[PDB]
Amino acid sequence: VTIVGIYSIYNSGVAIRTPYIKILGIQSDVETSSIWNSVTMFTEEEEEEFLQLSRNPKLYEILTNSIAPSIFGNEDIKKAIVCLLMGGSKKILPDGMRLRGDINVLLLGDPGTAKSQLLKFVEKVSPIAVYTSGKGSSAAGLTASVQRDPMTREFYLEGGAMVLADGGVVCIDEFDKM
Amino acid sequence: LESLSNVKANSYSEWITQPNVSRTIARELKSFLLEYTDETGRSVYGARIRTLGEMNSESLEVNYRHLAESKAILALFLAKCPEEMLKIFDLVAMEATELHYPDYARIHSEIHVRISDFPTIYSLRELRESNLSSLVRVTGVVTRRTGVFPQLKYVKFNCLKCGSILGPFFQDSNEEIRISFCTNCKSKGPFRVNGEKTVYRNYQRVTLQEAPGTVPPGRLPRHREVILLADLVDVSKPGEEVEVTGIYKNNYDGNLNAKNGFPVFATIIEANSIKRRVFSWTEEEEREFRKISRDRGIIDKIISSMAPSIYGHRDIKTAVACSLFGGVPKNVNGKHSIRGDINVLLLGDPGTAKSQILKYVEKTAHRAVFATGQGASAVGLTASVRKDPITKEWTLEGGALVLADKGVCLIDEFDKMNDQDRTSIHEAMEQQSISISKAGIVTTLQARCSIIAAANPNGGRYNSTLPLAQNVSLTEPILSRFDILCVVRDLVDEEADERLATFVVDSHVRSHPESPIPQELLMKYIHYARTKIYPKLHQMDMDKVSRVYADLRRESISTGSFPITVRHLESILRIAESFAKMRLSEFVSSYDLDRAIKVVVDSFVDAQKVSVRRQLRRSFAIY
Amino acid sequence: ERVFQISFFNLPTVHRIRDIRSEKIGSLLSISGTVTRTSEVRPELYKASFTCDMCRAIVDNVEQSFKYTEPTFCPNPSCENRAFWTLNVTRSRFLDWQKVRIQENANEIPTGSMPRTLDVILRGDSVERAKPGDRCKFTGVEIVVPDVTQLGLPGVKPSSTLDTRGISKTLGVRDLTYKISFLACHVISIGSSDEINELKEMVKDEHIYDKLVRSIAPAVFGHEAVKKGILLQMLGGVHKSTVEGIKLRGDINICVVGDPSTSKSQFLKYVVGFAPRSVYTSGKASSAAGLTAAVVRDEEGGDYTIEAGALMLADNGICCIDEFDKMDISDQVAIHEAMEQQTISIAKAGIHATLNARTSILAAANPVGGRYNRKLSLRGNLNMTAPIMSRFDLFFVILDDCNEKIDTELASHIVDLHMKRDEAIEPPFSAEQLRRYIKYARTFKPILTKEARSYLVEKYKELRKDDASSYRITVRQLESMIRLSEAIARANCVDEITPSFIAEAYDLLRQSIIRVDVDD
Amino acid sequence: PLRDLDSEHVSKIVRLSGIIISTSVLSSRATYLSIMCRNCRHTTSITI
Ligand SMILES: Nc1ncnc2c1ncn2[C@@H]1O[C@H](COP(=O)(O)OP(=O)(O)OP(=O)(O)O)[C@@H](O)[C@H]1O
Ligand SMILES: Nc1ncnc2c1ncn2[C@@H]1O[C@H](COP(=O)(O)OP(=O)(O)O)[C@@H](O)[C@H]1O
Ligand SMILES: [Mg+2]
Ligand SMILES: [Mg+2]
Ligand SMILES: [Zn+2]
Ligand SMILES: [Zn+2]
Ligand SMILES: [Zn+2]
């Protein structure tokens, strides 16, 4: 963030005071977009533009070409990624069962086939995305973790990429080690 | 009076503060400042105040040798009771500045006095009860440091009966000041300080500890507390030995004397001057940089200047230089990132001068950080939230990888890391960023740094009969993120033994008591080159590069070795960029491409088994 | 103005810390103990000065007598003040003050009981005279000071109240608990002359080296190489500094490997009983704070202080570590830090510090499996870690060989020792003589010669060529050979290393490497 | 920079950059108080 305020003091050496800031304004740089801070309103110009783009007879080809134009080949992989990002349709049944609508994809291959850059691009291009490996990240777990609050000494979700990315996509590298 | 001060009326403190003798010594100090001149006849103090005024400074340094020689009596009374003469000579310096410059008070209301060259040097263990409230000069190491705090200087008070704001009253840095009489009300009721109408200064506390080398055997180092005021704050960071001149005095305030036990007191030192017991450049240096760059054979000129204290290992040193200069990062449309930091790996047998190479790199880089997979180190590899022992607040700390953003991270004993360190290293190398989800904090930190690592083979000895992947405990995902693998084998040979042994024995005999670019210029050269050079490529080398890549691929597949993949082409381009940067040129030549090709091909061939290695030596003999 | 102090000493008798009684309160006696801790020297209020409040009268030179005291009445009838005073910290005097903690002697602790401790107070010019880890004899007065901690103990505790008989009419009760302390006036440590003639006579011997070797551990049969290591560990190399700031080590480290049925511990016991500044410790009866150092921040009068550990003690000496194979990882890292850089970094309770650890380490290690499998190498038979294992410049592996003459000679020696006791020792030199010789010889700093450099180079080439066993050869062995050669040159009291001493060092180093047996 | 704040800036306006590491719970402060005297029941008010 960027903060604008007043540098002041208060009384808590011989004539020492403790500084602090009186906030006048806050400016955020946009961090950690999640499902709790989404925008579900669209400007009319954006809506009309998107409807116009939809009617394009070659939309599928353009979308396929848009996914990482800096890699050579792998048209089928890119089409798979389009289908993944779009996602299926979920159904809730009268008896309670849930039919999921998301798509899972695995990539077997030899070293140096550009299958990590595809994951990185998917991470950079999806509205919600976490990129991690098996065994998680440095000081960040891979699944939900429950911890006690340091001061109140009570339970809360400490973290976990799997829940942090709810409503998005999770990119797992080295899936065979966990 | 006139130099009659040698007559003593009573104790020195009482004598010094009489108005008549105060005026006498003030006038004589003013004459000292205005008249003193060396043999050359130049106005040393005149120039000192002139530059003070030009730079808009706040303090004048003074030499104790000159003052002693001129005015021994004043020098002695200064050494005895400096508290009063600091004020007196502060006023003298104020009037001197007023004489030289008009309305200096407009900007600065005070000019401080710094003494220098005090004849006697003490250690923290020698101070006793005969040094109290006197002038001392000690030396030690800095062990802790507080933040900067504001201290009252010109207090203004609010009357609670009438809203008058009583005028400024000076704070002497001895005890808190109070008021009791309101002029408007003629009252004595409650008062409160005015926060918004008060002027403050800077306060900082530093703990000094003796240097361990100087402590005689069998004992332990002592320590003290130091006070730094105004522009002495944030001058000496922890971990440096310094010399401090100040006034040795008790905590006369203490806490209270009703405390049970023996009536003992604690003591501090109020610093008057501090001094220490670079990578910037200028036009003068820039012209020399450019002159040295224009010469032919500058790459080999640089390589010979790496780690002078080690014999041989030319491949190691060229790789170190390449990773120490670095390439250029790229990003196409902001959606395809290519890194620019070159990573190297040292895999050698015991006793091969690897840790020395890492120490040299640490001492020569602008931002180098040292970690290890085993042993004591000032920092780990993982990010965490920890309490601050002195401030007692939660803090967010990254590892050595986060700390060395846009630098180099050195890791010793790379083969002895645990699961957490391995995960952190893998994430930093794959993504150049480190995540964290701890104690209510979710964020990502940048980890764009260069890595130089050292390790040992399984069993402590290299098995040349097996591929490199089976000689180390590391795994392919981590091992494939390096682009310069260096393998050191302690093969037994006679001439090499003569050379190394003579080097070592000569080194030892020199250090018994009783071509290469200079290093200090090399540091600035590296900094400037990284700051100012971004070489590019010409599309006319595409044919050569593609043909070489095809040849490498075909031979590798034919010989059934580890696959050659596009990563090697990217490494070649990065190394060519670094080689071009070494020359300060804006373009990549064909010679740089040839050098990068040699480096990468040699690295790839040297890491195979004996049969495959010898087969590949014949094929790629062109380089 | 001058403060004068008297110093009694040479009392007829000495008392133990375990035999102090409240009958001798306020009398002069002498005690002995081992110093555990010392504090910094601080000013002590001696003769205070006060300013009266009701009147501006001034009172000077008010005595304190072990506590903060105030004047009891205004000195003038012009003012009737009492109990209202202010302290002037600008015209009073102070004295140096230090606190020291001592501990019982090892041989004085009775059966089945833990040692005692006693506080000792130092003043004036006696301060900064004791040193932690030393044995000192004190002399002074036995005094009493308040002890607030004695509440909660059983029994009746004296209380004081003001007598209210004889006071016209028309609450200050105090507790009297105390503890015994000691305020000392003379302190001396307890461990030239005509003997320069003896020193010159003995150095002028020709076979001095053989006697020097034989007089080490005279009660142990054989094992000459271990003796020649223990010697040359007492006498060390020279510490060198490079122009670029690289420091070269001068200490020699040794490890003795054997099974529990061998006599490796006797060497350590002899060294600790003989060497000037030596400490003995066990692998499992130690701790990380037991080694290295600790910080004791509850200094009752002011700021913190540091308490030395095992490695801190015996600085510039020798440290003995039995059961070395039971050290944990953290303590192993601490020992490695001491070996690499002669410093110990202590970071606890928000306090940082650095401490010298220039020490030589004498270690005794058991084989991993209990018996030394001669089919394996040295690395396969040990439990240490590579960093510490690469810093041990000598590995003495002692094994058992059955032979009639050896067995009968050993049995005769043991039976002689039991039957004859002190009589059947007859060593060439006595412990005092060895200590004097070593003290003299540790101050020579030998130097290399032009002829010696090439000979040493050729010896290193020979050793490398022959290596191509227990463990391979690197340059570390060359540095060890230089260190050993210069140590031997010091041992022979010469200012220049000669090729003969280089050959001696090379042979000693070579003989210590054993061969791995293979089948068929 | 956060390390460049010092005495000269006291009571002025500054612009700073950094990372948030801790937010607390919401507190309550008064902006308008109605008070009464427990002896004579005299009433008044205060505005903040
Ligand atoms: N080629 C060499 N030239 C000069 N000195 C050398 C050389 N090889 C080793 N040394 C010296 O020998 C000792 C070897 O220790 P060093 O820590 O440098 O080795 P290393 O290869 O890192 O081994 P390890 O960490 O596995 O013990 C050091 O004194 C080093 O200066
Ligand atoms: N088919 C390809 N087209 C373009 N670039 C490629 C291709 N294959 C590999 N690369 C290059 O290799 C790098 C990706 O390697 P990497 O992500 O490590 O592959 P993997 O994850 O399969 O090991 C990219 O920087 C890219 O420039
Ligand atoms: Mg990959
Ligand atoms: Mg090393
Ligand atoms: Zn008023
Ligand atoms: Zn009075
Ligand atoms: Zn009322």
From Swiss-Prot, chain A:
One of its GO terms (cellular component) is cytoplasm. This is Minichromosome maintenance protein 5. It comes from the Eukaryota. The keyword Zinc does not apply. Acts as a component of the MCM2-7 complex (MCM complex) which is the putative replicative helicase essential for 'once per cell cycle' DNA replication initiation and elongation in eukaryotic cells. The active ATPase sites in the MCM2-7 ring are formed through the interaction surfaces of two neighboring subunits such that a critical structure of a conserved arginine finger motif is provided in trans relative to the ATP-binding site of the Walker A box of the adjacent subunit. One of its GO terms (molecular function) is ATP binding. The chain holds residues 292 to 485 of 775 of the full protein. It is found in: Nucleus. Disulfide bonds: none annotated. Belongs to the MCM family.
From Swiss-Prot, chain B:
A motif (Arginine finger) lies at residues 480-483. ATP binds at G348, D349, P350, G351, T352, A353, K354, S355. Changing K354A: Reduces MCM2-7 complex helicase activity. Abolishes MCM2-7 complex helicase activity. Reduces MCM2-7 complex helicase activity. GO terms for cellular component: CMG complex; cytoplasm; DNA replication preinitiation complex; MCM complex; nuclear pre-replicative complex; nuclear replication fork; nucleoplasm; nucleus. GO terms for biological process: DNA damage response; DNA replication; DNA strand elongation involved in DNA replication; double-strand break repair via break-induced replication; mitotic DNA replication initiation; pre-replicative complex assembly involved in nuclear cell cycle DNA replication; premeiotic DNA replication. A zinc finger (C4-type) spans 159-185. Residues 298-505 form the MCM domain. GO terms for molecular function: ATP binding; ATP hydrolysis activity; chromatin binding; DNA replication origin binding; helicase activity; zinc ion binding. Its EC number is 3.6.4.12. Keywords: ATP-binding, Cell cycle, DNA replication, DNA-binding, Helicase, Hydrolase, Metal-binding, Nucleotide-binding, Nucleus, Phosphoprotein, Zinc, Zinc-finger. Its main location: nucleus. It comes from the Eukaryota. Component of the MCM2-7 complex. The complex forms a toroidal hexameric ring with the proposed subunit order MCM2-MCM6-MCM4-MCM7-MCM3-MCM5; loaded onto DNA, forms a head-head double hexamer. This is DNA replication licensing factor MCM2. It comes from Saccharomyces cerevisiae (strain ATCC 204508 / S288c) (Baker's yeast).
UniProtKB/Swiss-Prot annotation, chain C:
The modification Phosphoserine is found at S113. ATP binds at G258, D259, P260, S261, T262, S263, K264, S265. Coiled coil: none annotated. It catalyses: ATP + H2O = ADP + phosphate + H(+). Residues 208-415 form the MCM domain. Keywords: ATP-binding, Cell cycle, DNA replication, DNA-binding, Helicase, Hydrolase, Nucleotide-binding, Nucleus, Phosphoprotein. Its main location: nucleus. GO terms for biological process: DNA replication; DNA replication initiation; DNA strand elongation involved in DNA replication; double-strand break repair via break-induced replication; mitotic DNA replication; pre-replicative complex assembly involved in nuclear cell cycle DNA replication; premeiotic DNA replication. A motif (Arginine finger) lies at residues 390-393. One of its GO terms (cellular component) is nucleoplasm. The keyword Nucleotide-binding applies. The modification Phosphothreonine is found at T449. One of its GO terms (molecular function) is ATP hydrolysis activity. The keyword Nuclease does not apply. Its EC number is 3.6.4.12. It is found in: Nucleus. It comes from the Eukaryota. Belongs to the MCM family. Acts as a component of the MCM2-7 complex (MCM complex) which is the putative replicative helicase essential for 'once per cell cycle' DNA replication initiation and elongation in eukaryotic cells. The active ATPase sites in the MCM2-7 ring are formed through the interaction surfaces of two neighboring subunits such that a critical structure of a conserved arginine finger motif is provided in trans relative to the ATP-binding site of the Walker A box of the adjacent subunit. The six ATPase active sites, however, are likely to contribute differentially to the complex helicase activity. This is DNA replication licensing factor MCM6.
From Swiss-Prot, chain D:
It is found in: Nucleus. Coiled coil: none annotated. Component of the MCM2-7 complex. The complex forms a toroidal hexameric ring with the proposed subunit order MCM2-MCM6-MCM4-MCM7-MCM3-MCM5; loaded onto DNA, forms a head-head double hexamer. Interacts with CSM1. Belongs to the MCM family. Acts as a component of the MCM2-7 complex (MCM complex) which is the putative replicative helicase essential for 'once per cell cycle' DNA replication initiation and elongation in eukaryotic cells. The active ATPase sites in the MCM2-7 ring are formed through the interaction surfaces of two neighboring subunits such that a critical structure of a conserved arginine finger motif is provided in trans relative to the ATP-binding site of the Walker A box of the adjacent subunit. Present with 10300 molecules/cell in log phase SD medium. Early fractionation of eukaryotic MCM proteins yielded a variety of dimeric, trimeric and tetrameric complexes with unclear biological significance. The MCM2-7 hexamer is the proposed physiological active complex. This is Minichromosome maintenance protein 5. The lineage of its organism: Eukaryota, Fungi, Dikarya, Ascomycota, Saccharomycotina. The gene is MCM5.
